[PDB]
Design a protein around this nucleic acid. Structure first.
Ligand SMILES: [Mg+2]
Length: 134
DNA sequence: CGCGAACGCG
DNA sequence: CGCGAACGCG
């Protein structure tokens, strides 16, 4: 399998797991930051990766782009394809925001179609994903 | 740590 | 028994 350079790559910046979650989507070729989510006070890395892919799908759909999305998270890719985020994170006041976003992302997936291929970034083959926070 | 995948009680 | 409940990464 070869890299598709005309694509969007996403990744999460965590401060702990669970912990603060942010994410962004970048042009795989140029590194241009296409969208970002400001720090969510608490969530899991998996939840953040799920949100990042869905944000990417919504971004690409709005722009009518056929570019694929790369994620390094096999778990998040499965959740998006299942249209179900199987997170174990407790639902309380503290986690209310991350769960609101996850629930809304699920709702989006269950009420829309999309053409974007969702591909696994292979770090062992290709190095860091372009959206890595470093 | 959180994920998916791989014992004990009825 | 046997059906659920309870390691390997990144
Ligand atoms: Mg990540």
């Amino acid at each position: 399998e070869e890299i598709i350079w005309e694509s969007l790559s996403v990744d999460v910046g965590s401060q702990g797991n669970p912990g603060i979650v942010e994410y962004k989507g970048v042009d795989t070729k140029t590194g241009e930051v296409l969208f970002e989510r400001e720090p969510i006070p608490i969530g899991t890395n998996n939840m953040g990766e799920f949100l990042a892919i869905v944000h990417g799908l919504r971004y690409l759909k709005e722009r009518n782009s056929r570019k694929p999305i790369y994620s390094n998270s096999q778990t998040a890719i499965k959740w998006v394809k299942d249209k179900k985020a199987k997170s174990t994170l407790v639902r309380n006041e503290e986690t209310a925001l991350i769960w609101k976003l996850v629930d809304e992302a699920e709702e989006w997936l269950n009420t829309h179609t999309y053409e974007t291929p969702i591909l696994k970034w292979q770090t062992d083959k290709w190095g860091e994903i372009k959206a890595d926070y470093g």
